Design a protein around this motif. Structure first.
Motif, PDB file in Angstrom:
ATOM      1  N   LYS A  79     -13.528  25.692  14.264  1.00  0.00           N
ATOM      2  CA  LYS A  79     -12.779  26.759  13.616  1.00  0.00           C
ATOM      3  C   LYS A  79     -12.299  27.770  14.650  1.00  0.00           C
ATOM      4  N   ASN A  80     -11.416  28.663  14.196  1.00  0.00           N
ATOM      5  CA  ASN A  80     -10.847  29.724  15.030  1.00  0.00           C
ATOM      6  C   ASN A  80     -10.124  29.164  16.252  1.00  0.00           C
ATOM      7  N   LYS A  81      -9.567  27.962  16.126  1.00  0.00           N
ATOM      8  CA  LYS A  81      -8.833  27.324  17.209  1.00  0.00           C
ATOM      9  C   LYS A  81      -7.551  26.719  16.658  1.00  0.00           C
ATOM     10  N   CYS A  82      -6.506  26.732  17.483  1.00  0.00           N
ATOM     11  CA  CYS A  82      -5.203  26.193  17.092  1.00  0.00           C
ATOM     12  C   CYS A  82      -5.059  24.747  17.572  1.00  0.00           C
ATOM     13  N   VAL A  83      -6.003  23.920  17.140  1.00  0.00           N
ATOM     14  CA  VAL A  83      -6.028  22.519  17.504  1.00  0.00           C
ATOM     15  C   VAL A  83      -5.458  21.695  16.356  1.00  0.00           C
ATOM     16  N   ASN A  84      -5.251  20.406  16.607  1.00  0.00           N
ATOM     17  CA  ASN A  84      -4.718  19.514  15.589  1.00  0.00           C
ATOM     18  C   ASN A  84      -5.803  19.124  14.594  1.00  0.00           C
ATOM     19  N   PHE A  85      -5.370  18.719  13.403  1.00  0.00           N
ATOM     20  CA  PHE A  85      -6.280  18.316  12.342  1.00  0.00           C
ATOM     21  C   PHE A  85      -5.684  17.134  11.591  1.00  0.00           C
ATOM     22  N   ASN A  86      -6.527  16.480  10.794  1.00  0.00           N
ATOM     23  CA  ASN A  86      -6.106  15.324  10.010  1.00  0.00           C
ATOM     24  C   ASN A  86      -7.018  15.201   8.802  1.00  0.00           C
ATOM     25  N   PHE A  87      -6.435  15.266   7.606  1.00  0.00           N
ATOM     26  CA  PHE A  87      -7.181  15.169   6.355  1.00  0.00           C
ATOM     27  C   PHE A  87      -6.449  14.205   5.431  1.00  0.00           C
ATOM     28  N   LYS A  98     -11.059   4.396  12.418  1.00  0.00           N
ATOM     29  CA  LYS A  98     -10.922   5.746  12.958  1.00  0.00           C
ATOM     30  C   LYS A  98     -12.193   6.519  12.639  1.00  0.00           C
ATOM     31  N   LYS A  99     -12.969   6.838  13.670  1.00  0.00           N
ATOM     32  CA  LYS A  99     -14.210   7.574  13.486  1.00  0.00           C
ATOM     33  C   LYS A  99     -13.932   9.067  13.352  1.00  0.00           C
ATOM     34  N   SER A 100     -14.741   9.728  12.528  1.00  0.00           N
ATOM     35  CA  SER A 100     -14.602  11.157  12.290  1.00  0.00           C
ATOM     36  C   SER A 100     -15.353  11.946  13.355  1.00  0.00           C
ATOM     37  N   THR A 101     -14.795  13.090  13.729  1.00  0.00           N
ATOM     38  CA  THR A 101     -15.379  13.958  14.736  1.00  0.00           C
ATOM     39  C   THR A 101     -16.025  15.169  14.057  1.00  0.00           C
ATOM     40  N   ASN A 102     -16.208  16.253  14.808  1.00  0.00           N
ATOM     41  CA  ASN A 102     -16.806  17.465  14.279  1.00  0.00           C
ATOM     42  C   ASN A 102     -15.721  18.401  13.749  1.00  0.00           C
ATOM     43  N   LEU A 103     -16.141  19.574  13.283  1.00  0.00           N
ATOM     44  CA  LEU A 103     -15.239  20.577  12.734  1.00  0.00           C
ATOM     45  C   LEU A 103     -15.303  21.833  13.592  1.00  0.00           C
ATOM     46  N   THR A 150      -0.763  21.178  12.570  1.00  0.00           N
ATOM     47  CA  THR A 150      -1.241  22.063  13.626  1.00  0.00           C
ATOM     48  C   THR A 150      -1.409  23.459  13.049  1.00  0.00           C
ATOM     49  N   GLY A 151      -2.618  23.998  13.142  1.00  0.00           N
ATOM     50  CA  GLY A 151      -2.886  25.327  12.623  1.00  0.00           C
ATOM     51  C   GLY A 151      -4.335  25.695  12.848  1.00  0.00           C
ATOM     52  N   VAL A 152      -4.613  26.983  12.677  1.00  0.00           N
ATOM     53  CA  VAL A 152      -5.957  27.523  12.850  1.00  0.00           C
ATOM     54  C   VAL A 152      -6.692  27.451  11.519  1.00  0.00           C
ATOM     55  N   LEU A 153      -7.865  26.821  11.526  1.00  0.00           N
ATOM     56  CA  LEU A 153      -8.681  26.676  10.325  1.00  0.00           C
ATOM     57  C   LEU A 153      -9.582  27.900  10.197  1.00  0.00           C
ATOM     58  N   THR A 154      -9.281  28.758   9.229  1.00  0.00           N
ATOM     59  CA  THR A 154     -10.036  29.979   8.983  1.00  0.00           C
ATOM     60  C   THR A 154     -10.670  29.918   7.593  1.00  0.00           C
ATOM     61  N   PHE A 192       0.843  -1.185   0.000  1.00  0.00           N
ATOM     62  CA  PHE A 192       0.000   0.000   0.000  1.00  0.00           C
ATOM     63  C   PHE A 192       0.882   1.240   0.000  1.00  0.00           C
ATOM     64  N   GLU A 193       0.366   2.312  -0.590  1.00  0.00           N
ATOM     65  CA  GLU A 193       1.071   3.581  -0.675  1.00  0.00           C
ATOM     66  C   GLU A 193       0.633   4.510   0.452  1.00  0.00           C
ATOM     67  N   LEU A 194       1.383   5.599   0.617  1.00  0.00           N
ATOM     68  CA  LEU A 194       1.119   6.588   1.655  1.00  0.00           C
ATOM     69  C   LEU A 194       1.211   7.979   1.046  1.00  0.00           C
ATOM     70  N   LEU A 195       0.126   8.747   1.160  1.00  0.00           N
ATOM     71  CA  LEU A 195       0.056  10.124   0.670  1.00  0.00           C
ATOM     72  C   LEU A 195       0.331  10.192  -0.834  1.00  0.00           C
ATOM     73  N   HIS A 196      -0.506   9.482  -1.591  1.00  0.00           N
ATOM     74  CA  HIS A 196      -0.432   9.510  -3.045  1.00  0.00           C
ATOM     75  C   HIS A 196      -1.798   9.518  -3.718  1.00  0.00           C
ATOM     76  N   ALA A 197      -2.888   9.449  -2.959  1.00  0.00           N
ATOM     77  CA  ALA A 197      -4.233   9.437  -3.513  1.00  0.00           C
ATOM     78  C   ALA A 197      -5.202   9.858  -2.418  1.00  0.00           C
ATOM     79  N   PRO A 198      -6.379  10.371  -2.783  1.00  0.00           N
ATOM     80  CA  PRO A 198      -7.363  10.745  -1.761  1.00  0.00           C
ATOM     81  C   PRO A 198      -7.776   9.550  -0.914  1.00  0.00           C
TER      82      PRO A 198
END
Lengths: 50, 49
Positions: free
Chosen positions: B21-29, B14-19, B35-39, B1-7
């Protein structure tokens, strides 16, 4: 019908991410100068190629 | 299997949580973390990207 060949192109992206210009390298002596500087404006003077 | 080469389309248990914004929390896509603020952003991407 044409075949693709591995070359070097300098993609120019605008404000929307649309490719509007592409300069091909390894073809003309003038195009090889813009490949190293990574720009579209080359001033006068002597430069090094390879 | 590959890593970071396709959507993402497989992933795992791993269950998905909510979204939040305006917070410097961790993210995963699609496996990519950070780590960054989603604006808001005025720039748009492409449908095939």
């Amino acid at each position: 019908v044409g075949y693709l060949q591995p070359r070097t192109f300098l993609l120019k992206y605008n404000e929307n991410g649309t490719i509007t210009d592409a300069v091909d390298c390894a073809l003309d002596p003038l195009s090889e100068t813009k490949c190293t500087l990574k720009s579209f404006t080359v001033e006068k003077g002597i430069y090094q190629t390879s | 299997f590959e890593l970071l080469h396709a959507p993402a389309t497989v992933c795992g248990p791993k269950k998905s949580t909510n979204l939040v914004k305006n917070k410097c929390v961790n993210f995963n896509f699609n496996g990519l973390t950070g780590t960054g603020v989603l604006t808001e952003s005025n720039k748009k991407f492409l449908p095939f990207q």
